[PDB]
């Protein structure tokens, strides 16, 4: 069966209930090569997750939906066993494997719930051929009308809430915000942009090399120094990897810090999220559900002798790096979605009914 | 004539290029050494022309690198010492109402200053014990040797945690975390974009700062503004462990290049490629914490509020030496 | 150890900067309104060079008189520049034959050309080189320096790429060749013969031209009267390594920076680089040279501004601008990426995108300059619009309504400039 | 079902040593999954290689005899009918301890199209990361100037070269490359006209990559009897977890050797660092040998040897005085002094 990759090193006392998976000892070591219990699609996807290949949440959900399309293309019903039930009872261990590789985000949660509540709505008098075709088609209608029509309508909205000369602030890699700006420059307006990005997983250079390939100027500075740009800034177009129910905006690790300082310098904050990120889970403090990352990567190459060369030899020292931080629901001002510019605390009244 | 001159030149050099010497205390020590060399083995007769000499030397010594303001306030302190010694031996104009006895007396004042400045780490350490309790949490941005002695001697009697974040522009807090955990204080490192998450779990914030302006609005290694601002947002108290000589009688907007825009080859490394012809990567290494976020400066004479620092100003540097 | 000399061949031995090199040599062009030779002398003093035997062939008088009023000629410097000059020698090889015959140097000099823009603290590379040298009895003669860069960085011109096949165990050099128009690459298979331990060929090196040497190197230059560059020196050496080996060695650097202004495009990139702090401590605000003329004071947006600029109404400076002393920017202006030297003048509604001015330049109203150098006193009249890389130098003038094509260098000397100076691009004579 | 790990075997000959040679790739393919494995045989020495190959103990195979003689890639085109997913070819001559969950891990990771194991002329250029490769060609094509397309240097500005890399002929191909191999006929060898070609055609977005994972564990052998001797010398110790089931007494000089069943050792014979397992007549005096001894052996009366192997049906007894000789398959040499030279076979 599928093993469970053991933790790496040692976590921090306040974080015993969270898995700190490393990157070297992946979970392809201890499985059959023509993957037996796991499907080849799911093992490929779990692997290329854990390696750190696809990170942007939309890319996460897209790769997952494509691998699930493959699985549905190659599912066979065992004799005297309905599809609409054995399919789910087979999809469960795949989800446990994905969790063993890199913990599921909110995007994948909502995708999996959509799938497990759409499969169950196929008739028991439906043969595998037509039902499989309709499953593939419903997966396509999903991946088209919530992350490819969403980005469209959200770009069209945020194009009329972006003035001229204002230096919009962005944070790191995000498909939606870079699409918003690459579409709000080539539709007539002109502005500046100042990108911030935090280490070690410096996922801002993505937004950079996608911005300076459409003409618009840019500016890049580690999120510490963002206490200094904010005099100029006139908007903060944060990226959000997950929305919640109490109004908060759970996203990458700096977002909270940035929203706080960008409210204490009085520049209006925004986010951008599509209809499929509006989970009902709530979380007051970003400590009870994070995804601790391979700690042994914080160590940068300073001078000629890396300061954390032998890390775990020290008894007390205990690295960590959170990967999800929550903003309070009181700093966030906008949640631009394909049904309007809803205000922060008005998510669970709208994007749930 | 020649020895002091080449010493001043070598010193303005190794102050103009990089960090030399390393520890700010050692910069204060060498500045006082040079200023003693000048006050002893130079040419000056009246006290007024001596003040003017210290002036038209300190102008250069502080305009070389106008961000390292330990040497600046050391010059200003020796100026105030000249003024106080004049006031004593005068028994405001500047006539040579006395002579070479003045020289030995200035040397005595500077020696007393150098001695009470060598014993700074030991004082802040031996008084650190009265702020820490068992099983609590202490963030320390950057890597300050004085906060270091503080937190590594206050662990001979208690046990806590020290969630030492790291200065991101160029990771230096790692050496801090290692020099703590070698003394075994249950430390913890993280990337300074992770502050407004972990801050709800912090009992205190012992930041280390490079300077202290008049209002108490300090000038510390970067990011400390957002740390201090999150601390104000949770009203967790800051204990800005900053010794005496790191004071400075300047004022917030009385200077451009308040920060220190350093070679942006460490933010966006050069190995990047094409895009480095259009972006303008910034890199301020020194931020500006506003005053009312700070709560308790642990000088080497005991705690002091933030709205009390002007008294230390009026007691250290004369009120007419604020432009030098 | 003994002191660490540094030969400095302050004359770029090819007429790359015509027609400008007629006015003043290339070792006195101002990037940040400061002369190149001062950039290199400051680099050499920073690293710790004890003496720099600045050599010269073109306009000995100009360089010598400039350098006597430097900050190094004054006797206080810990790096006593001693100027040696003759009208004889014409190529770097002649310089090395000179430092061999006259027998001035003693060990481990720094054969840096005239005009590198660098802050490389090479002390550690020097120390590693001396280790390699005294470790195996004088068979490592030259330890070049090289900077990392992706092959598409704008400080990389179409004649400086050096595909340099290097061993990776001890960072040894094996083959060296420029790429002025190659879509293929040649590598004599003799590299792979002995050391099967890997030959990390690299195309991500940016020739910094700070090659260290030894007395055996000048010796070897005397041995062949046909060595006339560092380039073909290392090529010939690595070709006939088999006899008289003297293997080269390399040392890349990652967090430092250094380039060598060869032609005007690399000059443009490196001017923008020294403007945007990219080579701190070397940067205008610090005023490494001891003068009050360009003693600038830093500001936000890297928009420097020297003393007494007296910019006018609505003149919104954008980014990366310098402004030397004395200038006066008119009303309703717009400047960005420029380097306005001292003593200039400016009119109304006159954008200056990516331009570069040096001193005395007096642009009038309506002008719209772009990416175009304008040398000393290069006055301009109204309602003119320049175009990219449209150099115009040395008291040239442009008249009303007469724009220029894209690449159009105009000056006053008849046959070296592609046009001549007059009341426009027309009426040359 | 994701793979159909066919096993190349083109010209007893193969199953030489203390264990059958084909048994090593077959154990490698039955230790990590692969509940099915195709093999290929031709009429090189007999069409009926399958008849003797079916004596094994892991039967989950499908052998297929073929025509008279051909290369290697043409065999893959031969088997293409029963081939439907990502192929994982091998070479019947492979002996290693590779965690193949490294190689196929690398293939399945970066949606690649060609994996290959490799051990430290064959000019092989692996990228900086250590996995992906850029330059693969042997000096059989290039004459004296290693050429490089400038585009691959602009894209990957740090090409690393390795000179002495012995291939292990393990592969993990996608589907379209095998379809390509079928539609075309000009290509009559896999690792000599496909790898240099595929690398040579990094692009046809549909790009096609390749990843040559390097390692330091063990290598393959071939007809080279030096390589085979060294491979058996290594496998004598490698067989610890790959004797293991034997019925013998061993009342003489021998330790940490391949002592297999169907034999009983007597006394008075000293040969250590040697290989003699099944069918052993060890009761006579045998001097210090430290060398292999193939199947069907016959020797007695105070023998001696120095680093040599004697093929099937061997007879050298009564004072053997020779060093480094390959005694043929079915010759009996008893009264003659053999020098370092080989045996007449």
Residue numbers in the entry:
A (entry chain H): 166 to 518
B (entry chain D): 8 to 98, 119 to 351
C (entry chain J): 40 to 468
D (entry chain E): 1 to 11, 26 to 134, 155 to 238, 258 to 295, 342 to 444
Extract from the study:
eIF2B is an ~500 kDa decamer, assembled from two sets of five subunits (Kashiwagi et al., 2016). It has two catalytic sites, each comprised of the bipartite ε-subunit whose two domains embrace the nucleotide-binding eIF2γ enforcing a conformation that favors GDP dissociation and exchange with GTP.
(A) Overlay of the eIF2B apo structure (gray) and eIF2B in complex with two eIF2(αP) trimers (the αPγ complex; color-coded as in the adjacent cartoon).
